[PDB]
């Protein structure tokens with residue numbers, strides 16, 4: 001249930017959402033070992049954000065929220081607090097991606113999971 005996040009990613013980065021799937025060791029489902037770069041740390045932080053939401057009773061993988069983008073930035077909304085929290089985790093990630101556009105490297109898109117090595121940093 002990832003239409004909204006993808007749309008947020010595209011608005012904020014100018015790239016297709018597909019460019020952030022399987023990026024590094026953390027972007028995409030699950031993740032492990034040490035983040036390859038700052039964009040990947042965004043995804044590590046995002047996974048941590050979702051785990052916090054799951055411990056609150058939310059289902060952030062499934063929640064559908066509402067959002068807009070102006071110049072003031074990204075405005076999050078939703079009927080429930082869980083939807084709004086999901087939007088906040090995604091927003092922080094999309095902003096993090098935009099902020100690190102400067103070190104985004106195409107070589108890490110679709111990164112083979114065997115190249116993920118090191119310890120798994122804690123949340």
Ligand SMILES: Cc1c(C(=O)C(N)=O)c2c(OCC(=O)O)cccc2n1Cc1ccccc1C(F)(F)F
Pocket residue numbers: 002003005006007009017018019020021022026027028029030042043044046047050093
């Ligand atoms: C960037 C990202 C994710 C992350 O932010 C992350 N931390 O792993 C992500 C994701 O993470 C949620 C999680 O693993 O808890 C699952 C599926 C696709 C994901 N993607 C890619 C993505 C995002 C939005 C819409 C579509 C896609 C996709 F996969 F189609 F490219």
Ligand SMILES: [Ca+2]
Pocket residue numbers: 026027028029030031043044047
């Ligand atoms: Ca992930």
Ligand SMILES: [Cl-]
Pocket residue numbers: 045046048049089092
């Ligand atoms: Cl976060």
Ligand SMILES: [Cl-]
Pocket residue numbers: 079
């Ligand atoms: Cl609803």
